[PDB]
Design a protein around this nucleic acid. Structure first.
Ligand SMILES: [Mg+2]
Ligand SMILES: [Mg+2]
Ligand SMILES: [Mg+2]
Ligand SMILES: [Mg+2]
Ligand SMILES: [Mg+2]
Ligand SMILES: [Zn+2]
Lengths: 96, 124, 107, 242
RNA sequence: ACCGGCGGACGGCUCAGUAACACGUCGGUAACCUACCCUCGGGAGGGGGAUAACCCCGGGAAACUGGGGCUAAUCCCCCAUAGGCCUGGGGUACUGGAAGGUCCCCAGGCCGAAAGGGAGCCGUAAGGCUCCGCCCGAGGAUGGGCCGGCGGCCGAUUAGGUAGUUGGUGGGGUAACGGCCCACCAAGCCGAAGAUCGGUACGGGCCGUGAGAGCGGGAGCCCGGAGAUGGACACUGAGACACGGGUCC
């Protein structure tokens, strides 16, 4: 798969950066969250502990998928802002 | 007429309950709320009930009561009859809401054989 | 004196508190012009105005008339048959909501 | 509203001057009473979330506001129902950006970027003027705010004039009269967002509103209501306009 | 858990009643009310009181409910000042198309505020410095009340209808104008351009059909109205004669 970054935006008020990307992958299944997170942290030198993947979406007859993710500069800020369910779904914290 | 009497000591906050029947209870029939009567005349070993010495000629006044059916007495209604009236506060009604009024069944002033509970307090 | 209509005030004065020229009454809203068809009650007139209504299906017109009861100040004292000007006010009775302010052409 | 005031607002019945998607959801934010009226203002939540895009959901928009990150006319606003209206100034000091709220060419509210220096002044149209106890003069402006002046300067202020006020101190620094040759900006009606110079004024009997004629840069003449004409300068605008 | 504050009058449901200022549209209120919100101008002085919770004893088949003891507040009550309202006599500062309106000065009365309370730091302490708050006045905003002109069904095998009825004068009542309700004086008001009465129906944006002119419908989504088994009537509150609050038949 090939990852292409479309746009990176800075949000000082929240204290995070928002990343939009595309994944090109003909003849392959939709990439898993773990692989995409590893590829992204390798590509931009990000701490994997404070990186969340909001979504990965596939389309009808396309060879590519669209993804949106967020990166926080502080772990406490990430815990205070993000909803609980998205942290569980991305494996950052453990469900009770 | 059998009366269940609740005697309250205002100087300590302690109350005692005894049962009274017979000729003594016949004396109490006819009195309203707010009149005194010597305890010695009624006949009661008061010092045994509370385990305390009491001054002589101490007397008690009638404060309230409830009939055999559970309905209370209201000081502002004359006679021994039982009525059903619209109330907004006072004995016999607990509002629970601002401005609420409700129709309740109550008794009167005078004591009658239907009354079971009689709440009185000592007057030294 | 002026009350916002830019017309001539009446010649003489009155003491009616409901007179817009000499009393405390205020006028605000529509202003109409019409013909008096009745003056039987005290200080009251009935004014009739005619107009045309267009019927869309038959592409023709019909004549309609509107009747309004108005207060008649003593300083003006309109009669049957003359042209009057009326203005809207606050409610004065069950059916009176206008006052005569000028006679345009005496009968 | 059978027994009392309404508290809700459907999306389909929202004011027509907002930039909002009317079929995406069922409800909209009912604005709180405040400075402007319904037709010329929008709740602050939509500015934070939909216009600038600093937040995705309403919950995280409220967390931003409660931290005092937004200034309206130099004052911190925390209520997400607060109405923001014409000629207001929205400042974000942490990002250092400033906007002025203005109607569009079709009547919708938009944010126009402005310089930091211009962000300290706000124009106010004198909407009414009255006497008050102690024999003082009270001026009532178009956004509902009030000001007091002594009896000595009663002849320097009349209705439809514009006052340039320094915010948030609320200190007067300029008065712009309403007369022929003044520069005006239209706020409502068919000719909204057009600007120009006053040529003529007309009046009518029995309480009908009065009309003004305006010549634009290209030399065309158009009419509008007097109360829809907002004075912004003597012969050139004193503030940035799109 | 209890006392206390705010909310529970919105939202949700249905179309029985209603041919009417119910609804659509243009205007008016100089004839009116508005808790929460915004701006400006001021104020927060001195006293008093009970009670829930809690302890003792209970009554009643239950629904409910009695007596005694003890206590606090942003709970309740007084005094002062500010302030509000009515009437009479002057002066002309404001808005407006136009002042029974606003402002200034005398005079006789009546009504009549407030919680410097709570939280955190620096304070050795003294006292600051922020955050949320309480009361009065002027204006706005929001939500409404009331009024007018115009517009939209069928029947003559329904032709006369109305007597507080139509208008005037003097009052009462209302948040406010008004026969809204009284006392007195007149004979008015509506009608073959269809009154009165009867029938059938919640009104509109819209929807079905047709080349069009037209003809037919108006349950579902939005805006307005009305109702809570039928018929009457009140308490609290800024707002109700209140669908999950109260009284009678
Ligand atoms: Mg309701
Ligand atoms: Mg029906
Ligand atoms: Mg007092
Ligand atoms: Mg119909
Ligand atoms: Mg249905
Ligand atoms: Zn006259």
């Amino acid at each position: 798969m090939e990852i292409k970054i479309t746009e990176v935006k800075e949000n000082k008020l929240i204290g995070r950066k928002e990343i939009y990307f595309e994944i090109y992958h003909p003849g392959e299944p939709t990439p898993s969250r773990k692989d995409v997170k590893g590829k992204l942290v390798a590509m931009l030198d990000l701490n994997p502990e404070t990186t969340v993947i909001q979504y990965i979406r596939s389309y009808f007859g396309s060879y590519k998928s669209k993804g949106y993710a967020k990166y926080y500069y502080d772990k406490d800020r990430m815990l205070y802002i993000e909803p609980e369910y998205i942290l569980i779904r991305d494996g950052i914290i453990e469900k009770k | 007429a059998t009366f269940k009497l609740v005697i309250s000591d205002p100087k300590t906050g302690i109350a005692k309950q005894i049962e009274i029947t017979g000729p003594e209870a016949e004396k109490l029939i006819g009195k309203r709320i707010g009149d005194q009567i010597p305890v010695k005349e009624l006949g009661i070993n008061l010092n045994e009930l509370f385990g305390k010495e009491f001054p002589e000629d101490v007397k008690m006044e009638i404060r309230g009561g409830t009939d055999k059916d559970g309905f209370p007495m209201r000081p502002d209604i004359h006679g021994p009859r039982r009525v059903r009236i619209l109330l907004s506060k006072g004995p016999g009604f607990r509002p629970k809401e601002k401005g609420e009024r409700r129709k309740k069944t109550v008794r009167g002033n005078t004591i009658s054989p239907e009354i079971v509970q009689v709440n009185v307090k000592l007057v030294y | 004196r002026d009350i916002g209509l830019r017309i001539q005030p009446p010649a003489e004065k009155c003491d009616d508190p409901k007179c817009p020229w000499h009393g405390h009454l205020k006028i605000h809203g529509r202003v109409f012009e019409g013909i008096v068809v009745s003056d039987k009650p005290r200080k009251t007139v009935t004014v009739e105005r005619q107009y045309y209504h267009y019927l869309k299906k038959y592409e023709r017109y019909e004549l309609r008339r509107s009747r309004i009861h108005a207060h008649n100040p003593p300083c003006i004292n309109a009669k049957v048959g003359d042209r009057v000007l009326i203005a809207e006010t606050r409610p004065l009775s069950k059916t009176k909501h206008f006052v005569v302010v000028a006679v345009l052409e005496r009968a | 509203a059978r027994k009392g005031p309404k508290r809700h607002l459907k999306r389909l019945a929202a004011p027509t001057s907002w930039y909002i998607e009317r079929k995406a959801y069922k409800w909209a934010v009912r604005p709180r009473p405040g400075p402007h009226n319904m037709r010329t203002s929008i709740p602050l939540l939509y500015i934070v979330r939909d216009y600038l895009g600093y937040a995705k959901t309403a919950r995280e928009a409220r967390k931003i506001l409660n931290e005092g990150k937004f200034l309206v006319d130099g004052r911190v606003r925390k209520d997400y129902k607060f109405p923001v209206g014409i000629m207001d100034v929205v400042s974000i000091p942490e990002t250092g950006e400033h906007y002025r709220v203005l109607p569009n060419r079709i009547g919708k509210l938009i944010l126009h970027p402005i310089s930091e220096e211009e962000a300290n002044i706000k124009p106010l149209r004198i909407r009414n003027k009255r006497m008050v106890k102690g024999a003082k003069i009270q001026l009532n402006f178009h956004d509902g705010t009030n000001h007091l002046i002594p009896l000595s300067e009663k002849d320097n202020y009349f209705t439809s004039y514009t006052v340039l006020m320094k915010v948030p101190e609320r200190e007067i620094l300029e008065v712009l009269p309403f007369e022929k040759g003044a520069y005006v900006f239209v706020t409502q009606g068919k000719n909204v967002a057009r600007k120009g110079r006053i040529v003529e004024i007309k009046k009518f009997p029995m309480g009908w509103p009065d009309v003004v004629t305006i010549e634009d840069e290209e030399g065309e003449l158009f009419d509008t209501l007097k109360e829809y004409a907002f004075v912004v300068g003597r012969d050139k605008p004193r503030i940035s306009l799109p």
